[PDB]
């Protein structure tokens, strides 16, 4: 997490950094519980903006 | 919606359409097919990740 963590600030805004930092999840999963994550599909829609499946 | 090619495995895909409606049509070979009016604005479709 603590590569995840800073890789999404780096690749949000500080408005969409600061939305994400207050997760910290820490003690809720701590170390006893883990998250997976995949993505099944991408499609653009427009200027700037997307939807992730 | 999903598609398949005739067999090739098929695939799950996505569409988003925009679109509108320009009333009937003033066409025989139209209206017989569209008659009321049914238009895409805008079209789009992408693979579904399973």
Same mark, same amino acid.
């Given at each position: ?14 408005? +969409?950094?600061?939305?994400?930092? !207050? ?8 170390? !006893?519980?883990?998250?997976? +994550? =995949? +993505? ?5 829609? $427009?200027? $700037?903006?997307?939807?992730? =499946? | ?16 359409? $925009? ?17 009321? $009016? ?5 079209? =789009? ?6």
């Amino acid at each position: 997490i603590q590569m995840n963590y800073d890789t999404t600030a780096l690749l949000s805004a500080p408005a +969409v950094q600061q939305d994400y930092y !207050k997760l910290f999840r820490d003690r809720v999963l701590g170390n !006893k519980a883990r998250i997976t +994550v =995949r +993505v099944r599909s991408i499609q653009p829609n $427009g200027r $700037g903006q997307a939807t992730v =499946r | 919606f999903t598609t398949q090619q005739h067999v090739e495995a098929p695939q799950h895909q996505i569409a988003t359409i $925009g679109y509108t409606y320009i009333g009937a049509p003033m066409r025989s070979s139209d209206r017989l097919l569209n008659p009321l $009016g049914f238009q895409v604005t805008s079209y =789009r479709a992408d693979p579904e990740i399973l």
